[PDB]
Design a protein around this nucleic acid. Sequence first.
RNA 1: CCGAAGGUGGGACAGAUGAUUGGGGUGAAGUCGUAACAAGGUAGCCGUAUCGGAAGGUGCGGCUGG
RNA 2: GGAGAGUUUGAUCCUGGCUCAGGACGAACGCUGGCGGCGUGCCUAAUACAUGCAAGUCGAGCGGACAGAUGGGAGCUUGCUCCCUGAUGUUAGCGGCGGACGGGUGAGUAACACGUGGGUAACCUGCCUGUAAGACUGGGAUAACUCCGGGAAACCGGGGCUAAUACCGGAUGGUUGUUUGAACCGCAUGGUUCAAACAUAAAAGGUGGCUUCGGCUACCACUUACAGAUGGACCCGCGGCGCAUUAGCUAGUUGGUGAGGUAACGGCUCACCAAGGCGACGAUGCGUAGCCGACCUGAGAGGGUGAUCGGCCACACUGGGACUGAGACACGGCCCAGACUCCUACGGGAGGCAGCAGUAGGGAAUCUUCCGCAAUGGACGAAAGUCUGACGGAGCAACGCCGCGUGAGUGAUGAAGGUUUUCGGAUCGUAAAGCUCUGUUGUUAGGGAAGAACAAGUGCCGUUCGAAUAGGGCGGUACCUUGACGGUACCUAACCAGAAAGCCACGGCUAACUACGUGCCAGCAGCCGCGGUAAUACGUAGGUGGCAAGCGUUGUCCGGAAUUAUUGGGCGUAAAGGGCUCGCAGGCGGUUUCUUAAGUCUGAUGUGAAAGCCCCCGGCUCAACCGGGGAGGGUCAUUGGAAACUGGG
Lengths: 88, 68, 195, 84
Amino acid sequence: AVKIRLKRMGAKKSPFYRIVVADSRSPRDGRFIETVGTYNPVAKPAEVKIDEELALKWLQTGAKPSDTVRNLFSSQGIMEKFHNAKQG
Amino acid sequence: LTNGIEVTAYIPGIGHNLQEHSVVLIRGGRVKDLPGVRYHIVRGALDTAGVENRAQGRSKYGTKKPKA
Amino acid sequence: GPSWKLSRRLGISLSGTGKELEKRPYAPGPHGPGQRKKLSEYGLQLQEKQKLRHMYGVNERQFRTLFDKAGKLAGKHGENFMILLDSRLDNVVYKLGLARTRRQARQLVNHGHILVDGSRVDIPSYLVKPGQTIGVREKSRNLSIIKESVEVNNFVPEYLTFDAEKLEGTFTRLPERSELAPEINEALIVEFYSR
Amino acid sequence: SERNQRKVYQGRVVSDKMDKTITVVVETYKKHTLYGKRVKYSKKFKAHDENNQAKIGDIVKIMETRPLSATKRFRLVEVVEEAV
RNA sequence: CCGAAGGUGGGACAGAUGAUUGGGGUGAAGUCGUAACAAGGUAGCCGUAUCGGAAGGUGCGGCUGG
RNA sequence: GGAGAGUUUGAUCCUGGCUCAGGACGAACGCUGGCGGCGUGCCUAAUACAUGCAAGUCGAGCGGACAGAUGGGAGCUUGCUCCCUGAUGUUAGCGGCGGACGGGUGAGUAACACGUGGGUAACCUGCCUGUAAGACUGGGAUAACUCCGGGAAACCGGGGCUAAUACCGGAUGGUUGUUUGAACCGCAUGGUUCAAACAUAAAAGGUGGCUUCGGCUACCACUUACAGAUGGACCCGCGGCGCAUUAGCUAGUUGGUGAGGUAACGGCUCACCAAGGCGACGAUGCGUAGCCGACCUGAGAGGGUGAUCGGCCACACUGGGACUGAGACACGGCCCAGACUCCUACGGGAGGCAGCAGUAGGGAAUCUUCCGCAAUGGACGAAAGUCUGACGGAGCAACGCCGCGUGAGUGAUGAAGGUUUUCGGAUCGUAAAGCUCUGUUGUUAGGGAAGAACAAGUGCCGUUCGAAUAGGGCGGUACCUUGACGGUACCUAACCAGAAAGCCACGGCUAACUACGUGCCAGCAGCCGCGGUAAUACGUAGGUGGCAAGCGUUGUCCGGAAUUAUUGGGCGUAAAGGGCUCGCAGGCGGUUUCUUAAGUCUGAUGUGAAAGCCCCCGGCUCAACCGGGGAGGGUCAUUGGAAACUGGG
C-alpha cells in the first residue's frame, strides 16, 4: 500500500528526486501523503538528503520503500535504526 | 465564408488576381472610406496572389523578396 | 556595424576619445549637417537609453531584463542598472584594458577565450560578481591583441585592479556610478521604461 | 478524550405545521467582497422537535446532527425565549 | 413490479423561411413646399385631440428654454 | 507604485464618446530565417476511424501435456531408429492476484461538482504493517484431456476422466445476533469496557534443509480479532453566473408511524395519515459553464482566462442494467436497445482511438504509424524475470522564452558606384578595399562523462527463529554486474571572414526625409485624414529610425479609461431628481450609564498540498530553467484577552 518512493522533479536532461511517501495507486508526480527530503543523482558525487526521523516514523506504521529508496535509507543508515527498533 | 456569412471585404494592394468563386482568406480590417466593408482580403493567401511590382511593405500585400 | 555612425547620431563619444565626432559632429546623412531641430521628451529619453545600450551593445531583451532585475535590487534605480551593465563581462574585458573597443572585447569573451575563476566563459552577458579573478588560459596566454592592449596603457578604474604579465583582473567592493559614466543621463532611462 | 463538537446555532421559529418539526431562521450576517458594507441574510433550517414543544416566534438553539430525513439535519437544544 | 428505447397525443419554447407589408438608415446638385433657427416674417416648445400631400395647422392647458 | 495624445469650434473652456501609443497568447497569416538549452504544440467535430502496440503475470497452488536424455537396453546397412523418468526448458486450461491503477477527453454538470472549514455516536477499506489466537476431519464435482454430435464461422451441446491454495460438508473459535447482569461517559438517536449463556462463523497448503520417517523448523501463503496506515463514502457553514421582456414553483414534493433497502443516515424505496415545502435574501424556468491551485493585465482594487503542470469531478459510440471483485455499476469487461462500419453459407456473428503514433473530415491552424524499459514509478512473482505507448528519450514546427551568432582592431583615395545638389559639394563613410587578427559557431579528426543507486548471486559479521553450527529471515559491510538516449552533451587539435539579416516605419501622436513618377486616378489609413501638375502621408530609390532571427498584420484579453468611479464620477443649463404624496419590507439612528460580546481588534493552535508569484543561497559555460530554504495568501475552525465604537438587553 503506502510506499516511500522517489518522485521526479527537475528539467528534462537533469533529473531530481524528492523522496516522497505516496501510494502505489497515485501517479508518480501526482498526489502524495508527505515528503522526506531529496535525491540528486546527477551530481558527480553523492548528496542525498533524508529527513531520517519522519522517514523512520513512516517506516514503522508500515510503508515499505522501493529498492533505490531502501538503499538510500541504508546509505544514510535508517534501516539499521529500524532493525535496532525491531530488535528492541 | 465557412461559417456561412457573406461579407463585403476589401482587396488592398494595386491590381488583384481575383475572380468570382475565388478562395479568399479574410482578416479583420476596417475600411473607413467605403461604407459597409470591415475586413481585408489577406494578400498572399490561399489563392489571392501577392501583388505586382512592390518592394516596400513586403510582408503586407504578400510579395516575396524578389531578387538582387 | 559602422559604430562611428552610432556615435555621431547619438551625439556622444561612445568610445570616449577625440575620434568619431571631430570633422563631423552632426548626426548622419543628407539631413544631418543642416541645423537639426531639438528633440521632444520622447526623443531625449530615447537618446539617453540608446546612449547607454549602444555603449554596451545590448539588445532590448537583455536591456529590459537587466532594467527589471536592477529594479529588484535596492537603492536608486538608474544607478543599479548602470552597475549591472558595468558588471557585464565585455565591459570587464574592455575596462581591464584587453581590447580597444567593446566589439573586440566581445570577440575575446565569445571565442578568443577569457576565463573567470577557473574553467572558461564563452558568454559576453555574464554578469561578473565581485571577488572574481579574471584572466586568460595558458593557450591564449599573451597573443597579439591582448599584447597590444597591454602595450597601450589605459587607466584601471578604482573598482578594478589589473596586472600586466599575470593579467589577472580582480575587483573591489562595487562600481559607484560617479565612477562609471559622466555623459549618460540615468533616470531619463528609468522614465523611458516608466511608460 | 472528549470527542469533536458539532455545529450549533440559535434562531427563530418560522413554522410549526410539520409533524414533530420546525424551521428556524438564523440571522447571521456578513459583508461583501467589494463594497465592504455588512448586509443581512436569513437562513431557515429544518430542525426536529421530538416533544413538539415549540411555537412560532420562539428564540431557540439547534444542534446539527446526522440527516434525520430529507432536508433535516438539526435538533433542539434549549428553547430560550418564548413568543408573546 | 420497475424499466431504456420506441409509439400515440396535446401543448410550450427556439431558429429558419414566406406572397406581401410597415416604419428605419444611407446614397449620384431629383420633385413639392419652407416648418424651425432673427420678432424666422403666425414667438417656439411640452402634453393631448383633431385635420391636412408634406413639413405642419388648429383647439385646450402649461412653459420661457421670448 | 500611478505619464498621455488626436478629434465637436472662426477661436476657446467644459461635458462626452471614439481612436492611438503597452503587455500577453496552446494563437494564425505575410515577409524572412543560423544554432543550442528549456518548455509547448487539434482551442475546431465529445466527428468517423484502416493498421500497430496501450494489462498482464505466477510452474514455490494445481492436473495434463510438449520436448529432453543421466544412466538402461534394442535392430541392422555405419546411415541411423527407440523406450525407461535425470536434471533441464516450453506453457492451451484450472486457480490466485491484477485488470477499478496508470494514460485520454471536457461532452455533460449551476449543485455539495469544486474550493475552504467542519461533523460522522451513521459508515466501508484488498494489498501494507504491528500484536494476539489459530490452522484440525472428510466429502463430492469440473476445465484441460479425450470420444461423439451440432455449427459458414463465432463456437456450442452430450457421455467419459482428473487435481488444487478451486468448491462444499464437519469439529474448535474472544467475530456477528439474541437474552440477562454490571461499571463509567455523552450530543437527541446514544457511546466505551467486563461477565455469562444460546446460535452459528474459520482456515491451505507450497518450496528448501534437517531427520529415528511419527514428525520438526524457516520463508511465503491461509483464518479470526484489535490497532495503525492508506484509499473510499455520506452530511453541513461559507464562496465563486447571465437574464424578471423567467413570478409563482413542488406533490414522494414537505413531515410523521411502520416496513424494506443500503457499507451506512435518509422519501433512498413502499403502505397509511397530515397539508406541508421553496420563494423578490430571486424559487422555478431559460442560456452559458468542468471547479480549483494558478495564468495574463493592472499602481492596486479589479477585469479576463481555467492550455501545459498538479488536486477533485464527470465521461468512455447513445440510453439503461447488473455481474464479479475489498473497491466498478468497469476507457481497452459483460447483458440489452438504437445508429453506424464489417463478415455471412442468410441461420447468425464481430466492433468501439475522448490510451501512444497515425488516417480522413471540419478548420486560420497545431506534430512521428520512432527507440527503450537503462533510470523513476506501477502489476505479478519467493525471486531471476515478464508486462508497461505510464515514463525516460528521440523526431517535426521560430510555436514561446532564453542564450551565442552573421565578424573584430586599424583604416581618408572620404576610392568606384547610388541618391541629392543653390553643382562649391553633402551623403551612403572608416562603412568597402589596405594592413593585422580571432574561431564561439562551420567543417574535418581524435578522446570521452554524470544520469548507476541497484536488484539478484556470492562471502563475512551481529542478531531472531529453530531440536540444532541445518536452513531461512532482518541490518551492516565486501565484491561481481547492468545505458534506449549515444560515442549525445562535453573536451582537444586543423582550416578559411570564409556558410549565416531580415522585417516594419519615417506628417502629428511617434523615434525617423529627401528625390523621381502619379494627378481625388492609382492608391494609403488606427485616428486626425492624404492624393484634383510643385504629395516629407500614394508607388519606387536613397537615407534614417525602431527592433532584431526575428519583424509586421490580424483575432481576443487587460490597461490607457477616474469610460460602471469601493479605491475613484455624476443629475439647475451638457446624459441624469420619479409629477407628487401615504407608507410595508429594507437601510440609517439624539444623549448618560450598566452589562453582553454578534461585528471589530489582538494572541495561541490547526490548516489554506506539490509546483507557481516573491525573498535568500546554490547548480547548469551565463541566461531561460533547475534545486534548496523561507515568506505570502481565509469575512476559515477551535480557543484566550480588550470593551472605544456598531449591535443586543
